[PDB]
Amino acid sequence: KVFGRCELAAAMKRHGLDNYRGYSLGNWVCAAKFESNFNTQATNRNTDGSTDYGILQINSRWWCNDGRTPGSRNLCNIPCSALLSSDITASVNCAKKIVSDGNGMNAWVAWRNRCKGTDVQAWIRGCRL
């Protein structure tokens, strides 16, 4: 599914991401925009042989199992395919564990490089929340 901006903001809020670990909704939406362009089916292969999955580009080395990433720890206890579903619940659950892991949203390099310190409130402009 390719979410609209406000549609994804509403879904994230409904799944308890708004201000999770102190990160406002706009941070999450901005991160999704630059990780996946709001496309739940996005997949991308990393240089280390792992792959990133879903709206927030969660990896298969630490977080989910894809069966082809040696050293996989699967800390989210989820097949990586679950992170491609139209329903964002599995991605949100796993992202909550990621953002709690010590470095906050710096876990997402695109967040650090494109969202951190910017006017992230713009991502929720006009939305009926």
Q: Which residues are catalytic?
A: 35, 52
| Residue span binding Yb ion (CB under 5 A) among the ranges 2-10, 64-72, 83-91, 113-121 | 83-91
- State yes or no: residue 87 binds Yb ion (CB under 5 A): yes
> Which residues, 6 or more positions from 32, have their beta carbon under 8 angstroms from its beta carbon?
3, 8, 12, 38, 55, 56
* Nearer CB in complex with Cl ion: 29/84: 29
Radius of gyration of the chain (CA): 14
Q: How far apart are the first and last CA of the chain?
A: 21
Q: How far apart are CA 55 and CA 40, in angstroms?
A: 5
Query: What track of x and - describes contact with Cl ion for positions 67 through 96 (by CB under 5 A)?
Result: ------------------------------
- State yes or no: residue 26 binds Cl ion (CB under 5 A): yes
As measured in angstroms, the least distance from the Cβ of 120 to Cl ion is: 5
Q: Which residues pair with 54 in a beta bridge?
A: none
Query: What track of x and - describes contact with Yb ion for positions 37 through 66 (by CB under 5 A)?
Result: ---------------x--------------
Closest C-alpha among 93, 81, 76, 95 to residue 35 = 95
| Binding-site residues from annotation for substrate | 101
Contacts to Yb ion by CB under 5 A: 52, 87
